[PDB]
Design a protein around this ligand. Structure first.
Ligand SMILES: CC(C)(COP(=O)(O)OP(=O)(O)OC[C@H]1O[C@@H](n2cnc3c(N)ncnc32)[C@H](O)[C@@H]1OP(=O)(O)O)[C@@H](O)C(=O)NCCC(=O)NCCSCC[C@@](O)(CC(=O)O)C(=O)O
Ligand SMILES: CC(C)(COP(=O)(O)OP(=O)(O)OC[C@H]1O[C@@H](n2cnc3c(N)ncnc32)[C@H](O)[C@@H]1OP(=O)(O)O)[C@@H](O)C(=O)NCCC(=O)NCCSCC[C@@](O)(CC(=O)O)C(=O)O
Lengths: 429, 429
């Protein structure tokens, strides 16, 4: 009998996986997977296999995979709006279950995130009172922190539930949080950039992305398509990235899903991390202030480098080739905004940057990453408020960090608490 | 010529250390320090030498050291109020410089944190508007996030400063943040537990701890002494603990010191982490509701265990013996509140718990940790609001996480971005 329910599927899923991880461990737990070097320790774990994260795997050459699903593969397999871009709802199912969803499942998440989208009074209040010089990421993070009041996992814990049921309450709070996100994010956008106006109502008949754009107040049918792709591609990037790892580290201590997410966001707000979104546009913005020749394009790049600054949008800790997330974006401008002068610049930089970075001989990866291409796309659509970009990243990333978080707790992952050493202590070792 | 200035000392300190770390690396960077096992990956990095953290080192047997300074050693070497407990100001100097401060230096930090203690209007406003069912840690974290508006490092970055000067702005923001902390924390305390009253003014002639207690509204001369010790002992606990590591991870991305600290706090708010502060008291509180015999004390313990719950205040990821931080606390009750019935219970549990935990055969470390002893002490003094304890932990921990943070940036530590794997991926390895 009956219909669609993710929680029920997971219930079926958990015990098998649990069983699966036990025997593997019983046999291989002692297996050395790697070594740790001094350089590794001073180098921010660069190269260190430190975590188990199941939702996605980053390949140094090919890049990110969702099951073992590449972006191009997701693009063709994931249910769409009616209607060329993959629905983030579907990416979510996929990340959660390892399986490709049916349009039917896809519709369930949509309704689900629609029914659940509700902002408590104390949150609206705070956001309403936030100064305008308060960065959108800051506002975003305080808000999510402030929502913790509402944690089903926090309450259940306080009640004394057995550890075995953790995942259950994590799941509820993950679904609620995902659902509330576009409301919080839009409210900040409305406050800061459209003072006096209102977010409106969520309509149970639309997909999440669509209700989001409606809340942001964008009408362009192509903008909606942008959104769906954007929120899908930004989902998840394995576990080692600052935002995902922070949520993983914080969640490990038993802090509810709200608290872990907001810390994840303080992470994404960093310039070398998500903020590159924004830094890229302000660097272009500045570029243009100072139709240029490659030679002047190259002088500009050197001065950045020479000034002990980074060239935003290039480089990666794990990727060693152009980010397929970059290509994905380029192919979208190519279809939709090929004559855009910002676009062209971005295309022009592609030709120069890497070569200049190779020339400098410092960057291990001279290729662009996802952040080099995102904003260009947004600006075209009339969303030119650059200090807001990372919020968009923010909302998407939730899909991936909450998908895994529920697994961690399902699998009983323990407290993340490695050993640290001092230089003296290492000198002595 | 001239007088005391920490920043100047550091300026002298950085280049030597920098030079010191380079040659070491030039010679030993390739040196394997350890291996990584499958169990390690599923086990939250348990046993993994993953980070360089210079301010403190946790020994599995002896416990925490500040230089190479033990708590008992700090207790005798650190300048005091007039006047038995070590001043957290001095611990700070010590953590920052590796050297024991003079009373004269100690006085400088005090004035310094006094001159700098100032809360912007948008912060007071938010805290004032926070609901009372909003946990104090949540309020604490949102507030610190909200202060980021004020980041000297954030502004300097946005201006395009060379990487080499990072530490300079980090230092300023660390000093400002440390200074503002007791104001934020007290304001929450005043709001929630003393509605209508006010935090008052900071007096440049007192030590930080003293102005703190004044802001909390405690008069007891022994309470002040409590505070100083409390804030000193909670300072730092090497780099691998959830709060310290989170600040380290987030700071690595270039998020300012405000944002990194607040994420650190979402970490400390976890039940297996700082929240144990609170969980302990509510477990005792419940214990007493249900002068008991060891046998009933032991039935009580088993029911906790049997219910898939933890016994708060016992156990540690790295320590394998009683936490000297626990002993420190016990010796304080012994001097000051030896007949307190809560105290006695806590003494009684010491005799039972571990034995029961040994009986169960699960905990690697059956001994109590710092959190098992803290609240008992607070409650005696009339600070019986248990949901506030972790805030106290909060304020102290800043001393250690900001001390190192300035070093990280001084030493140019890179982005913390390890490799993650999936189970499939490991199964395949
Ligand atoms: C990304 C980045 C931090 C990688 O750091 P890394 O692994 O330590 O880099 P590296 O090439 O090994 O570093 C060697 C040297 O090259 C320098 N270098 C690297 N990239 C750059 C750059 N774009 N400009 C100038 N110099 C650079 C490094 O700063 C370093 O300098 P020093 O030895 O004096 O510090 C670095 O390339 C950079 O700072 N880029 C500029 C900022 C930027 O574009 N940030 C984008 C990050 S993408 C965010 C998301 C992610 O893809 C992240 C992930 O998976 O981790 C995800 O979805 O979550
Ligand atoms: C502290 C703690 C998480 C260590 O976790 P761990 O290293 O994974 O522990 P372990 O002994 O290796 O775990 C083996 C098994 O024993 C169980 N066990 C350990 N402690 C307890 C306990 N108190 N009660 C019941 N069972 C326990 C573990 O849960 C685990 O169970 P499963 O295999 O079914 O999960 C664990 O002992 C615990 O949950 N304790 C109860 C909560 C508590 O007292 N928290 C206090 C943490 S101190 C905070 C601060 C710190 O000292 C932290 C630091 O340095 O990291 C600092 O200053 O920052």
């Amino acid at each position: 009998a009956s219909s669609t329910n993710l929680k029920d599927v997971l219930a079926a899923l958990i015990p098998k996986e649990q069983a699966r991880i036990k025997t593997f461990r019983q046999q291989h737990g002692g297996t050395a997977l790697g070594q740790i070097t001094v350089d590794m320790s001073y180098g921010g774990m660069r190269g260190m296999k430190g975590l188990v994260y199941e939702t996605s795997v980053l390949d140094p050459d090919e890049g990110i995979r969702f099951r073992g699903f590449s972006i191009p593969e997701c693009q063709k397999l994931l249910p769409k709006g009616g209607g060329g871009e993959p629905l983030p709802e579907g990416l979510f199912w996929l990340l959660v279950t390892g399986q490709i969803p049916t349009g039917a499942q896809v519709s369930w998440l949509s309704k689900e995130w629609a029914k659940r989208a509700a902002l408590p009074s104390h949150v609206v209040t705070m956001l309403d009172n936030f100064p305008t010089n308060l960065h959108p990421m800051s506002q975003l993070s305080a808000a999510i922190t402030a929502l913790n009041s509402e944690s089903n996992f926090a309450r259940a814990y306080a009640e004394g539930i057995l550890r075995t049921k953790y995942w259950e309450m994590v799941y509820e709070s993950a679904m609620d949080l995902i659902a509330k996100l576009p409301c919080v994010a839009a409210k900040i956008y409305r406050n800061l950039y459209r003072a006096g106006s209102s977010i409106g109502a969520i309509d149970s008949k639309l997909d999440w992305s669509h209700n989001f754009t409606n809340m942001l107040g964008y009408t362009d049918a192509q903008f909606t398509e942008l959104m769906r792709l954007y929120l899908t591609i930004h989902s998840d990037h394995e576990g080692g990235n600052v935002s995902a790892h922070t949520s993983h580290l914080v969640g490990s201590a038993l802090s509810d899903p709200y608290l872990s997410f907001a810390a994840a966001m303080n992470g994404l707000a960093g310039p070398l991390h998500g903020l590159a979104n924004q830094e890229v546009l302000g660097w272009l913005a500045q570029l243009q202030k100072a139709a240029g020749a490659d030679a002047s394009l190259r002088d500009y790049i050197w001065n950045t480098l020479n000034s002990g600054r980074v060239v935003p949008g290039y480089g990666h800790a794990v990727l060693r080739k152009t980010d397929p997330r970059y290509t994905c974006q380029r192919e979208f401008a190519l279809k939709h905004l090929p004559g855009d002068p910002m676009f062209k610049l971005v295309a022009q930089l592609y030709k120069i940057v890497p070569n200049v970075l190779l020339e400098q001989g410092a960057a291990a990866n001279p290729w662009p990453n996802v952040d080099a291409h995102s904003g260009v796309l947004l600006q075209y659509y009339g969303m030119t408020e650059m200090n807001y970009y990372t919020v968009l990243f923010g909302v998407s990333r939730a899909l991936g960090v909450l998908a895994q978080l529920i697994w961690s707790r399902a699998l009983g992952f323990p407290l993340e608490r490695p050993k640290s050493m001092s230089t003296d202590g290492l000198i002595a070792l």
